[PDB]
Design an enzyme around this catalytic site. Structure first.
Site, mmCIF file in Angstrom:
data_model
loop_
_atom_site.group_PDB
_atom_site.id
_atom_site.type_symbol
_atom_site.label_atom_id
_atom_site.label_comp_id
_atom_site.label_asym_id
_atom_site.label_seq_id
_atom_site.Cartn_x
_atom_site.Cartn_y
_atom_site.Cartn_z
ATOM 1 N NE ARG A 1 -3.021 -1.172 3.415
ATOM 2 C CZ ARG A 1 -3.268 -2.311 4.101
ATOM 3 N NH1 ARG A 1 -4.470 -2.878 3.374
ATOM 4 N NH2 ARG A 1 -2.772 -2.564 5.138
ATOM 5 C CG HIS B 1 5.767 -0.674 2.613
ATOM 6 N ND1 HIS B 1 4.801 -1.081 3.897
ATOM 7 C CD2 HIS B 1 5.203 0.150 1.989
ATOM 8 C CE1 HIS B 1 3.451 -0.450 3.378
ATOM 9 N NE2 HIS B 1 3.725 0.122 2.184
ATOM 10 N N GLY B 2 8.922 -2.513 5.031
ATOM 11 C CA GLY B 2 10.204 -3.426 5.019
ATOM 12 C C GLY B 2 9.873 -4.811 5.462
ATOM 13 C CB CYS C 1 6.923 -4.523 8.985
ATOM 14 S SG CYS C 1 5.133 -3.948 8.959
#
Lengths: 238, 5
Positions: free
Chosen positions: A37, A96-97, A139
């Site tokens: 997203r 994000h991760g 994350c």
């Protein structure tokens, strides 16, 4: 008296903000990321960090929507800069991760250690003996954390602080209306406690406490942030 | 509506 890092130059140093919001290219290019997203809410994190670290006399350097290639090119530009008149370097990554990595907006992976190790004593001598601070909001896996009821030589990798939003293997949370649990707690605690002269480890302990008390009720989920450090002195931002 | 990163 405890040893404290010098922290008096104007500016203190650069505060980079790598602020990834638009993941259209990841959705196009990387099969498993087809539904990843856009990170709505990340503007509120960038805004809080900017305000917080400007007040602490850092020079804020925002970069929005960076691919992995661009992140490496940006960090190289700062690696090669002269920080002789600076007392500190900070880099904030909002993305994000997954385990040990953060994503570029193209969906490629950058190992966190490959980012931080660009600022060792050998790679950036004008920051040797000076604190290098990385805050990573991503994350580090897809598991929900569960909840329970209650002259002198120094090492090449000295003077780092790595503030992770979460322990390994687990998610960290973003509220589109508020920002992220971790960065919002971090800025609140910095803004309340720096004027009192508290050091960054005290502050990050409070961030651990505050983020620990939040709940993802839909998944009975928690979040546990995790600092790691090779700091050799107290780190205060006067 | 929390979202993971």
């Amino acid at each position: 008296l405890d040893k404290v890092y010098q922290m008096k130059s104007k500016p203190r140093g650069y505060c980079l903000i790598i602020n990834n919001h638009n993941f259209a290219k990841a959705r196009e290019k990387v099969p498993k990321l087809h539904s990843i997203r856009d990170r709505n809410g990340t503007h509120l994190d960038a805004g809080a960090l900017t305000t917080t670290f400007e007040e602490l006399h850092f020079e804020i350097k925002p970069h929005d929507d960076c691919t992995v290639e661009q992140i490496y090119e940006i960090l190289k530009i700062y690696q090669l800069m002269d920080h002789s008149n600076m007392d500190c370097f900070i880099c904030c990554i909002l993305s994000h991760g997954d385990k040990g990595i953060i994503y570029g907006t193209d969906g490629q992976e950058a190992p966190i250690y490959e980012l931080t190790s660009q600022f060792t004593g050998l790679k950036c001598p004008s920051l040797a003996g000076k604190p290098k601070v990385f805050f990573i909001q991503a994350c580090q896996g897809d598991n929900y954390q569960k909840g329970i009821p209650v002259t002198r030589y120094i090492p090449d990798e000295a003077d780092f602080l790595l503030g992770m939003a979460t322990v390994n293997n687990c998610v960290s949370y973003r509220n589109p209306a508020e920002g992220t649990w971790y960065i919002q707690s971090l800025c609140q605690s910095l803004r309340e406690r720096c004027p009192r002269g508290d050091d960054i480890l005290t502050i990050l302990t409070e961030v651990n406490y505050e983020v620990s008390n939040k709940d993802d009720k839909k998944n009975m989920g928690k979040q546990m942030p995790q600092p790691t450090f090779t700091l050799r002195k107290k780190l205060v931002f006067p | 509506x929390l979202q993971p990163x």
